[PDB]
Amino acid sequence: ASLVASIVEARKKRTAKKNITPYQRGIIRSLILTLDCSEAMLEKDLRPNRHAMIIQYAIDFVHEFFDQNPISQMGIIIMRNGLAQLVSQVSGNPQDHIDALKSIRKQEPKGNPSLQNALEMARGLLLPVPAHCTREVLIVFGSLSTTDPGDIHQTIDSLVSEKIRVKVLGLSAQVAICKELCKATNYGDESFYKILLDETHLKELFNEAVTPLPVNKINKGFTLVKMGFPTRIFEDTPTFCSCHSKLVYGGYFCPNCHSKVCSLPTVCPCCDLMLILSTHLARSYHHLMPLKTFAEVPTTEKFRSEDCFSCQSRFPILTSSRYRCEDCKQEFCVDCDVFIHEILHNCPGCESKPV
Amino acid sequence: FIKGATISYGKVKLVIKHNRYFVETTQADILQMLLNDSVIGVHSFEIANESVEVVKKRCQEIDYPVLEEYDFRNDHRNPDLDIDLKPSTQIRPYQEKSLSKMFGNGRARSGIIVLPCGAGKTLVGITAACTIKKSVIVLCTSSVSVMQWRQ
Amino acid sequence: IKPVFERFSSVIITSGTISPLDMYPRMLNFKTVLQKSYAMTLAKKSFLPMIITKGSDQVAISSRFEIRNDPSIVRNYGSMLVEFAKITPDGMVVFFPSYLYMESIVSMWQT
Ligand SMILES: [Zn+2]
Ligand SMILES: [Zn+2]
Ligand SMILES: [Zn+2]
Ligand SMILES: [Zn+2]
């Protein structure tokens, strides 16, 4: 009954994932990572520490977000001891955020939260943000209480007026205020306020939260952006960079002012334009067209092939692990189907199928 | 070895009928085996009460062991000492298991308990006295220590 | 409620937690033409009833009017109060049979 339980849990997951839709999602993103050094995250119920696995899983999320969404920029606000602090603003450089993260790892967490203070200066950080740059904040919380200098509801209505969507990730259980926050922040939706059960589910929440979020018709931002690629020149001399003024052997040229920069994807510092490559736009076409799930055929029918169409391995008999792409009508194994849906972004059976 | 480790349990019983060791048996069936041994001197008889210590050894070699399992509640003759404890004391589960060792039947099984130092062995003995609830005395070859267990 | 009975035929009686039913036609000299009870056909259980007869120290607990001022059982009761105060997300209510006893225990608790 182990395979039957695995099949019915995969059915429940498939019922959750039936809504495969090509929604327009948040691409030009601006992120704030609210963190807390409070005394609640000192508890050794988590091994070695709540704050420990916060530090390492935050480093992993920083890497995953800079990979999956390179063109976006993400900031870090730390809550500690009655007043929140800023250690990293929004940047295309992960290195500064990683260095701040390991500085927080070196230091001790202690304090008590002021979520209104964190939201207020997060509001000020997102104040000079363009309209196409979507404003999103991620929230972690290890407690059940927060004292705040003033009322939270004016802050709530003001941030709703600032057109923001926010996910909140609590430690213990659901809190009614954070549920209301995700409700009013996310147009009545309360799927944005989720609580973990263990570290495996916690990491799964991180891997979900790297992904972009679909955007509504009513908050329409249909416009154009003035984009331009830089040109890499493998130069023969140590040469000054525009930003840090240090002598670099090779690098890029600006498409307009011909200045060089250390890294991509970054704006120009001089003529002030976003300079990316085809990789960064190429990173999210599998968001732009998704990959619909593949028809796991039953063992009752006769099959076109009794071995895998892709990895070329023979199919088993009690259950039929022959998973058929509806866009290609070729059955694949469970291993190849899971790997293609998690990594690959084209069906080779659909490459075989002529159109 | 386990099969040969089968004893005449419940078959020999000494009762102290007011400082008088009456060595009963549960049946007359025990008496015919017991009379084969002649070191001595339902059915009891005269034994030198100091010689009980040596004939306990002697019945260990002739493999009919006596048991000491006090029916204090059925011994109405000895005056009970009904003394309880406070609820603030907390019995640890190994002490609870130790209390279950001599109270598998409720009759006070006599024996040996050795525990590590500082394990509240005084408190375990106090609990054992508070559930035995009869006339009872405490012995130890010292003075400063004996008065501090009194305290 | 007698002049209600002889004034109105269609006298219909209901409540939420009236259990059992039989002593109410005893305490009130009447009868019903029919009476039964209803329990919900809920999908999964979301109210969680349990009976706590002992603290985490395994000490029997009661609120009798004589042993109500027993400070050891009081300390147990506040160990329970501490452990639900640490974990309460939104709201939690405690009742007792008598308000003087509430004021007595909360007075010494604050003390
Ligand atoms: Zn530079
Ligand atoms: Zn430029
Ligand atoms: Zn395969
Ligand atoms: Zn296909």
Give me the DSSP letters along B28-56: THHHHHHTT------------TTTHHHHH
Question: How far is the CA of A15 from the CAs of A11, A62, A331, in angstroms?
Answer: 6, 30, 21
Q: How far apart are CA A89 and CA A92, in angstroms?
A: 10
Say which residues have a Cβ less than 8 Å from residue B138's Cβ, sequence separation at least 6: B125, B146, B149
Q: How far apart are CA A50 and CA A36, in angstroms?
A: 11
CB-count exposure of residue C63 (10 Å: 0-12, 13-18, 19+)? middle
- B41 CB near a chain C CB, below 8 Å? no
Alpha helices (H) in chain A, listed in sequence order:
2-16, 50-68, 94-106, 115-125, 153-161, 176-185, 199-210, 278-282, 285-288, 334-342, 348-352
Spatial contact of A178 and A170, defined as CB atoms under 8 Å apart: yes
CA of A263 to the centre of ligand 1 (A): 8
**What would you report as the CA-atom Rg of chain C, rounded to the nearest whole angstrom?**
21
Do chains B and A have 3 or more beta-carbon pairs under 8 angstroms?
A: no
The strand pairing partners of A266, in sequence order, are: A275
**Is residue A187 left, alpha or beta, with left meaning phi > 0 and alpha meaning psi from -120 to 50?**
left
The resolution in Å comes to 3.8
B125 is in an annotated binding site: no
Q: How far apart are CA A256 and CA A229, in angstroms?
A: 10
Residue of C nearest to A173 (CA): C89
Q: How many angstroms separate the first and last alpha carbons of chain B?
A: 48
The three state secondary structure string of A162-187 is CCEEEEEEECCCCCHHHHHHHHHHCC
Please list all protein residues whose beta carbon sits less than 5 angstroms from ligand 1, which is an ion. Answer: A 241, 243-244, 262
**What would you report as the CA-atom Rg of chain B, rounded to the nearest whole angstrom?**
18
Q: How far apart are CA A233 and CA A260, in angstroms?
A: 9
Residue A85's SS3 state is strand
Long-range contact set of residues A46-51: C-beta below 8 Å, sequence gap at least 24: A46/A199, A50/A142, A50/A171, A51/A109
Spatial contact of B85 and B132, defined as CB atoms under 8 Å apart: no
Which residues on chain C are in Cβ contact (under 8 Å) with A176? 89-90
Residue A134's SS3 state is strand
Residue B115's SS3 state is coil
| Residues 84-103 of chain B whose Cβ lies under 8 A from any Cβ of chain C | 86-88, 90
Q: How far apart are CA A295 and CA A320, in angstroms?
A: 11
Q: Cα A38–A125–A154 angle (5° rounding)?
A: 75
Q: How far apart are CA A117 and CA A148, in angstroms?
A: 7
CB-count exposure of residue C7 (10 Å: 0-12, 13-18, 19+)? exposed
**At CB < 8 Å, which residues of chain A contact C?**
144, 172-176
Q: Cα B18–B23–B26 angle (5° rounding)?
A: 120
* Residue carrying the six token digits 């736009």: A281
DSSP 8-state assignment for residue A40: G
Question: How far is the CA of B26 from the CAs of A23, B10, B57, in angstroms?
Answer: 89, 7, 20
Do chains A and C have 3 or more beta-carbon pairs under 8 angstroms?
A: yes
Q: How far apart are CA A253 and CA A231, in angstroms?
A: 5
What is the token pair recorded at A31? 């992120």
Per the document, the length of chain A is 355
Q: How far apart are CA C75 and CA C98, in angstroms?
A: 19
> Which of B85, B88, B92 to mutate to test binding with chain C, by most C CBs within 10 Å of its CB?
B88
List all chains that touch chain B, counting a touch as 3 or more CB pairs closer than 8 Å.
C
Chains B–C, number of C-beta pairs less than 8 Å apart: 8
What is the token pair recorded at A114? 């002021």
Spatial strand order of the sheet with A73-80 comes to A83-91, A73-80, A29-37, A134-141, A164-170, A193-195
Positive or negative CA dihedral for B34, B36, B38, B39? negative
**Please, which experimental method was used?**
cryo-EM
What is the token pair recorded at A92? 């295309």
What is the token pair recorded at C65? 């009017």
Q: Which residues of B130-143 are buried (b: 16+ CB within 10 A; e: fewer)?
A: ebbeeeeeeeeeee
Spatial strand order of the sheet with A295-296 comes to A295-296, A323-325, A330-332
CA of A279 to the centre of ligand 4 (A): 24
Spatial contact of A88 and A46, defined as CB atoms under 8 Å apart: no
Q: How far is B90 from chain C (nearest CA, A)?
A: 7
